[PDB]
Amino acid sequence: GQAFRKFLPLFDRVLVERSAAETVTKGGIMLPEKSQGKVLQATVVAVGSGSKGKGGEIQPVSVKVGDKVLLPEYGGTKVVLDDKDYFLFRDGDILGKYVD
């Protein structure tokens, strides 16, 4: 398990930064900062040691740090480090990883 900004997530948990959302869509037209959303693409920035369950030995989380990943729209809890916003999810809740 590996950490970030002096923060180590526990058991199964993964910490991610949501990557900044669109201000100038498609054509040429600008949007308000909060309009109606949360952005669902995020880079993972921290990872827990693992859940230990489904066995007796620890089972490590399925994503490594620095992966691009797709979040679900509901779960995960906000945390703030050095006055910046990051979000914390269970490893199971994560839907997808982005490949090169």
Partner 1 sequence: DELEIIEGMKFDRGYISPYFINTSKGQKCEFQDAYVLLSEKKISSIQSIVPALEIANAHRKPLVIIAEDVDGEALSTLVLNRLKVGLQVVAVKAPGFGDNRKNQLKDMAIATGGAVFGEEGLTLNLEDVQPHDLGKVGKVIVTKDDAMLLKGKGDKAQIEKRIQEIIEQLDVTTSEYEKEKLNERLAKLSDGVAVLKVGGTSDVEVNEK
Near a second copy by CB under 8 A: residue from 27, 35, 82, 84: 35
30 lines the binding site for partner 1 (CB under 8 A): yes
Q: How far is the CB of 28 from a second copy (least distance, A)?
A: 17
Helix ranges, 13-80 (H): none
For position 8 contacting a second copy by CB under 8 A, the verdict is yes
Q: 75 near 28, Cβ under 8 Å? A: no
Is the Cβ–Cβ distance between 97 and 87 less than 8 Å?
no
Position 39 contacts a second copy (CB under 8 A): yes
Answer yes or no whether residue 94 interacts with a second copy by CB under 8 A: yes
Which residue's structure tokens are 């923060």? 7
